[PDB]
Amino acid sequence: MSYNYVVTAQKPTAVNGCVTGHFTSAEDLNLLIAKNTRLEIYVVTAEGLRPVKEVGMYGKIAVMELFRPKGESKDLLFILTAKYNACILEYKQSGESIDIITRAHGNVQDRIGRPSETGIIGIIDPECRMIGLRLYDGLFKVIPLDRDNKELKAFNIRLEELHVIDVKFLYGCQAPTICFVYQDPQGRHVKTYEVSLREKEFNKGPWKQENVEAEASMVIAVPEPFGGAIIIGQESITYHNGDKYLAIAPPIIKQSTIVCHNRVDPNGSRYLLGDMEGRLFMLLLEKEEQMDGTVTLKDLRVELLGETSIAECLTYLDNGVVFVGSRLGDSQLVKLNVDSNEQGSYVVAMETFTNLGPIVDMCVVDLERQGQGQLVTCSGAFKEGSLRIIRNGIGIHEHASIDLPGIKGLWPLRSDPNRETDDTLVLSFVGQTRVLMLNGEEVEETELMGFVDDQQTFFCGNVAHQQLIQITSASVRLVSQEPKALVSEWKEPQAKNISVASCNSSQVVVAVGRALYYLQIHPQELRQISHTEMEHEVACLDITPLGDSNGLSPLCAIGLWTDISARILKLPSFELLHKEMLGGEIIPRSILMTTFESSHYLLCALGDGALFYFGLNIETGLLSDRKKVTLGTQPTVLRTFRSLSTTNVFACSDRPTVIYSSNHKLVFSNVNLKEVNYMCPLNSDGYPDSLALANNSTLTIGTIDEIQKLHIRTVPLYESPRKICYQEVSQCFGVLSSRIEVQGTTALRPSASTQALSSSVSSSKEEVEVHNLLIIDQHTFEVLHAHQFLQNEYALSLVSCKLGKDPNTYFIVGTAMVYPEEAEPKQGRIVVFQYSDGKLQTVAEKEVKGAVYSMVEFNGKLLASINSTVRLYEWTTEKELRTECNHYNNIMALYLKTKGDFILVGDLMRSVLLLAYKPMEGNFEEIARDFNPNWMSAVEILDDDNFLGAENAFNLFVCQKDSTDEERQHLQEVGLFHLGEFVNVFCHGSLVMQTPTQGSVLFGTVNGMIGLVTSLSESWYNLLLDMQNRLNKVIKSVGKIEHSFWRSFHTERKTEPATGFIDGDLIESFLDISRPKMQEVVANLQYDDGMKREATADDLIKVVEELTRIH
């Protein structure tokens, strides 16, 4: 009944957890990072973090722990998902193939069970005797770690203590032993139990329980030789080992709750601690010797190290390097110095990693050009709060521009053998060559002795033995560097024209029609080594040397006319090693051997925009794993360039593209330029690390931005952004923000709201939140003005709009007055502001008797939700708001969207409702509601008949009218899908320049994931659903979780299969399965090019390409 497609535009960026150990090999130090559904694996080096493997799970990662059973040569990985999928994983590398194998799996949910309010805890015994899970209050689940237990069968033990705060397994125990903090009416306590596998029960623990601090929140199990447990609370740190109790109450920790810990030293001598304000502490355990050779704890000390990003997790990586995993701001690598700096800090930031999360609001604006949307998010919280401006594609910064038509090729040269930098740019034209010298930023034409100017150049460059080479249609010319003189010239025996050229430092391959010649470059000599006749005319050549080759290629890659083949030939024999037939009647135009992330590839571009690529074995010449992308409709020209110490490929066409690697897969990202015909890298004194680019009329020189799909600009606020709206007439954004002050009240740090150019305050007719409306310039993102709201006033909703017959555009803010003893607010305001002359004027205020959760402009009127009431206001001639009509049938109307006369209302707990304004009655009619209870987080109108909802348990659903009168009032849930993210905001728009799909709704999430929802026809839905079912049979899932299980709608109240939703991530993955798998997937499908007939792999590759470009 409803057909929707949902796909990831930006994967989650928030770090939910991190572990270190020896997973990829016994000798590697790994860092593993969980970003919701994604597991990232790195090797730690002196250099830094090397990415080795990234996988997606069909689940939200809730537990992630490395452990090493007896008999295992490296660590295994335990994962538990939020849906209670358990697995044990092993990393296997076989040559260049990397696989995550599932050693054991099973689902560990109970039948009865309310999920613990305080979350899943999973722990592993240091001796690998068992895994312990705290999933539900009153129960401790044990998975025995027998090699026979491949289904991860478990048993429950009754836990008398219902409210466990934290739990760990202790070190140095003859029986597996837990230590936990729990809360009862008498306060908080620490207790132990032994876990008996033979009795399937707890036994008495090795040390008696103790009372601990009221806010004790974390247990640390200390390794030998200490043993025992550290308990961290808000104002104290204790150590327990039974006949041993030590407690400190250091004032330095009292200001902010400590929420993460990490062991620095293997023997437990030192720990890192992080708090909610980003402070980083060292906790030091002092040893005392004993006559019997045991070691006991003499004392505990805490030292402030410095400040990081607000940390969800901390992992020491050796050599003073710490990974700071953040969910509220950017993650970091930081260095800990033995010695402090001038401010007193031991912490120096080394690297920053983007985190968009939480995305609490966003909007789409065409900031720069028409039809080019950019997303502007409210991101992060507290000192990490920011705006982020997100846009597709890679930018070029143009530093020179020369009118110079008809360029047919570009080559950089070093004319001076004792200078590292290029100083020369050689240009081809039809039948001609020109040489440009670069003196600083000046670009002067010149002659270069030895080169000819009256033939078209096909290649020129630096070659061996301090020589230059020029290959024209007439000849190969070898030139000495000092002086510049012709030292050798090669021509074909009858002086026929050269038609194609390739060259490296010491080797040349030229074609003459069907003939190939192989030359070597020697001192003052072009030596003809070998020649052959090809079966067909030669279209293109490459001899780029790959690997540890000492600059010599044993391979020649060639593309031919007629059979449209890409072939790998041996040099010098020209023996055929491998032939691939690319199909069609359009010849190959560019062919390249290249390396990305240490793997070798063959790229071959056809004249119609198709790019084929293959893995290349540089020993045997074998091509494998053919893939195909479309990069335009014109011939593509491929050229290697380096930026930021990585070789990538620039693809010149009508759609210029950079080809690069991510996670050992090739990626293709648009370059934000009009058509580029030719390019070369250029690294000159005046133009360092640059690119020369030519079109039909112009030569450009510029630098390229970071090679990535999305560009992100960060605007730090140093306080929490809450809501955003764009006001085109003022060329600014309005942003609601909140800062923490301590109780009047004192600010903790300067921030956007305290650092505006000018400021205003409402006049009254982690201690406290102070709320502000910020006015932010759309170009500079400077804070132009800040308006501070009343004490205890929280700003909840924001719109920019015109109303009534008034020509002005206003910022309008809805608020709540927040008092401690109120279950909800009973007072709030709507405030209408005008931004003029650098300041906000208050135009009008309206007191209302509740919180103004949501506002929307509605046909020149203001629609607002106020507690349980939806209200429509008119803007009168006297510039005040006046109630037109009200709707009362809500619990708490949190979310509003409108389309025409229709309003979609999202409720705290009663799902969604559809209102209509009735223009000839001047009131609302309730059209229909969804009678299924759902705890809503966001809503959107997809179209007049389809309503999208997101809810608190990470599901999407779609409601429609059911097409009685009591019947007409029941919305039907026709689409259901477990997304696995928490949606804060939906907004119509696209990041793609303005099909299988209709409409575009972007969404932003707590983890910083951005997604897209679009609509499908029944026909497309049916085809893609069939594809999913076929993909799910062939793809091996990590942990052997079923895709259908993962995507099943799931709340405490119900579990149902997904319906009416295509998983775009799964569909897009079709492009990465093997060709036999593609055949498996395609068999006996129906596809419409025409009439419904059998689909081919190539059909579906094209389809999934159409789908990828919607984001």
Ligand SMILES: Nc1ccc2cc[nH]c2c1
């Ligand atoms: N004891 C033991 C050893 C290896 C594995 C692999 C999965 N579960 C295990 C338990």
